[PDB]
Ligand binder design. Sequence first.
Ligand SMILES: *[C@@H]1O[C@H](CO)[C@@H](O[C@@H]2O[C@H](CO)[C@@H](O[C@@H]3O[C@H](CO)[C@@H](O[C@H]4O[C@H](CO)[C@@H](O[C@H]5O[C@H](CO)[C@@H](O[C@H]6O[C@H](CO)[C@@H](O)[C@H](O)[C@@H]6O)[C@H](O)[C@@H]5O)[C@H](O)[C@@H]4O)[C@H](O)[C@@H]3O)[C@H](O)[C@H]2NC(C)=O)[C@H](O)[C@H]1NC(C)=O
Ligand SMILES: *[C@@H]1O[C@H](CO)[C@@H](O[C@@H]2O[C@H](CO)[C@@H](O[C@@H]3O[C@H](CO)[C@@H](O)[C@H](O)[C@@H]3O)[C@H](O)[C@H]2NC(C)=O)[C@H](O)[C@H]1NC(C)=O
Ligand SMILES: *[C@@H]1O[C@H](CO)[C@@H](O)[C@H](O)[C@H]1NC(C)=O
Ligand SMILES: OC[C@H]1O[C@@H](O)[C@@H](O)[C@@H](O)[C@@H]1O
Ligand SMILES: [Fe+3]
Ligand SMILES: [Zn+2]
Ligand SMILES: [Zn+2]
Length: 341
Amino acid sequence: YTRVVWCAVGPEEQKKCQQWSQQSGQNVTCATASTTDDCIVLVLKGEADALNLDGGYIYTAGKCGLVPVLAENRKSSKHSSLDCVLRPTEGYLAVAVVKKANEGLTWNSLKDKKSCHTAVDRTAGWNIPMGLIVNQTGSCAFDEFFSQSCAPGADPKSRLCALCAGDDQGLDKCVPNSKEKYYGYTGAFRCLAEDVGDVAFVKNDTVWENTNGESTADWAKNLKREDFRLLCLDGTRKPVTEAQSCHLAVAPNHAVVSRSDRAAHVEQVLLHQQALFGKNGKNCPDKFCLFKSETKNLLFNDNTECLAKLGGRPTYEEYLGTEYVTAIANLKKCSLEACAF
Ligand SMILES: *[C@@H]1O[C@H](CO)[C@@H](O[C@@H]2O[C@H](CO)[C@@H](O[C@@H]3O[C@H](CO)[C@@H](O[C@H]4O[C@H](CO)[C@@H](O[C@H]5O[C@H](CO)[C@@H](O[C@H]6O[C@H](CO)[C@@H](O)[C@H](O)[C@@H]6O)[C@H](O)[C@@H]5O)[C@H](O)[C@@H]4O)[C@H](O)[C@@H]3O)[C@H](O)[C@H]2NC(C)=O)[C@H](O)[C@H]1NC(C)=O
Ligand SMILES: *[C@@H]1O[C@H](CO)[C@@H](O[C@@H]2O[C@H](CO)[C@@H](O[C@@H]3O[C@H](CO)[C@@H](O)[C@H](O)[C@@H]3O)[C@H](O)[C@H]2NC(C)=O)[C@H](O)[C@H]1NC(C)=O
Ligand SMILES: *[C@@H]1O[C@H](CO)[C@@H](O)[C@H](O)[C@H]1NC(C)=O
Ligand SMILES: OC[C@H]1O[C@@H](O)[C@@H](O)[C@@H](O)[C@@H]1O
Ligand SMILES: [Fe+3]
Ligand SMILES: [Zn+2]
Ligand SMILES: [Zn+2]
């Protein structure tokens, strides 16, 4: 009864959740799903209590009645005096990244190039870029803009999946979990880094966390920030240090969602779990760090300082903000009220 059930997406997050469970003395327990969507369903059904979601997915969840509870918060210079849990959430930047070596490639020369997406329905990896591409294009046939792509979640036999690779064996191609080589913020960036795609739609933080020896993963080891560039909307290319004047949009933080009739009990049990396994907990270094998964963003983004109270009891539209909610609406008519389930 004072026990939360977490939904994990893919085998790798189940292994992280079970590990969390053991350390929690069953205060927390796990359910597994092959995708975020089924995870949401499990939550509607009541078979699981919560998960942490990217904005794009929250939108979905919110039509189905789920509610944002706590948000991911990361480090900052502004607001310093404030404790992380109470500090407001700053947001994150969706940027388009390309190889410097790849000269002359601008936002305007994107037609027919190869693209790398975090996964379909996500904010930075999908909703923003295609939103804009649709708008500028007048067409809804965004499935034809890029000659080939890796957009996890799309029809595997489509070209949107042409660039995805599956796991060790090439099984599970294009599934939207971390089983797919190019899935998620990291996969997407790995996709470009290895020159599979010409372009990767990921957040700003991702370029910085995988270059200049920040990641140590064999494909990330030798990567150098200066070999990358950002695509601006004025069709101009800037270094990755100019994110603030060359981004596609600022996204709302990933956050934990739950059923409204459970939000209270999830919030409660969670803040206490963060006291223990969070950035500065009784047991982080030593036994288990909720926000570490080694460059993999499992359960939570790896750069999370803490999970923050929301303050102002946000309904999801409010949490996502009117700007973003519209950009999502206009995109969805291509392919306005429901529970997609
Ligand atoms: C775009 O997104 C990026 C990514 O989030 C933002 O860059 C981060 O922004 C914050 C605040 O602006 C930076 O501020 C610092 O926060 C640091 C903690 O991350 C603190 O810095 C200490 O520790 C850092 C690493 O954790 C490290 O940062 C830098 O320095 C070295 C080399 O210069 C590198 O990291 C090394 O240290 C770690 C130790 O944990 C080690 O494991 C590694 O092997 C490296 O040897 C790294 O390249 C990085 O450049 C410093 O060593 C420092 O001692 C500090 O408290 C400070 O407040 C933060 O550093 C940025 N993160 C990164 C990866 O650099 C950026 O804000 C965004 N920009 C826009 C426009 O939005
Ligand atoms: C794709 O194209 C659509 C069609 O225009 C874009 O929608 C438009 O976006 C702006 C800002 O989000 C809306 O303006 C707002 O209107 C209210 C009053 O209605 C105003 O008070 C606010 O301050 C704000 O300016 C505009 O109304 C809106 N139109 C529609 C139909 O929603 C959409 O944003 C584009 N998508 C992307 C990804 O850019
Ligand atoms: C299990 O939850 C109860 C309620 O707070 C608490 O006494 C106990 O510390 C929890 N176990 C752990 C290790 O968090
Ligand atoms: O999610 C909190 C906050 O995120 C910002 O980026 C905006 O979208 C706001 O409208 C919203 O309230
Ligand atoms: Fe995201
Ligand atoms: Zn801006
Ligand atoms: Zn309100």
